[PDB]
Structure formats: C-alpha cells, structure tokens
Design a protein around this ligand. Structure first.
Ligand code: ZN
Length: 67
C-alpha cells in the first residue's frame, strides 16, 4: 500500500504549537519587531490576556524561541 501512503505524508502540516505549563493550551507565535540582532526572530508565549499576578486565568510565563 505504498503509493497511497506516499502522498498522505505530504498532507501533514508543521507540528502544533507547544502548550504552556500554566494552562496547557496552545501558545501563540509572536515576532520581534525591535530592529537589531533579534529582528524578525520568532517565539512562543502563553495566549491568555494579561492580568493580575493573583489571576490564574491571566497569561503565564511560557517562553520558547522558535528554531
Ligand atoms: Zn498559559
């Protein structure tokens, strides 16, 4: 069943975003716009809105450079 198999592979998109530890939910991909050595680099961070340090629903501290 090789042939049908071969094209199934090509339909497989990039792996999902990592999940944050605070909520176990897909992070979101932001792009650095600060011109400099990092300009254009991308990273993942928690997707929750910002909020009070006492708020479990607020954004958590996940950070991961996209390689
Ligand atoms: Zn989070």
């Amino acid at each position: 069943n090789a042939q049908t198999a071969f094209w199934k592979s090509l339909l497989k998109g990039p792996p999902p975003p990592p999940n944050c530890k605070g909520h176990s939910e897909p992070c979101v991909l932001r792009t650095v716009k600060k011109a400099g050595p990092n300009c254009g680099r991308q990273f993942y961070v928690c997707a929750r809105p910002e909020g009070h340090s006492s708020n479990p629903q607020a954004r958590c501290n996940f950070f991961l450079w996209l390689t």
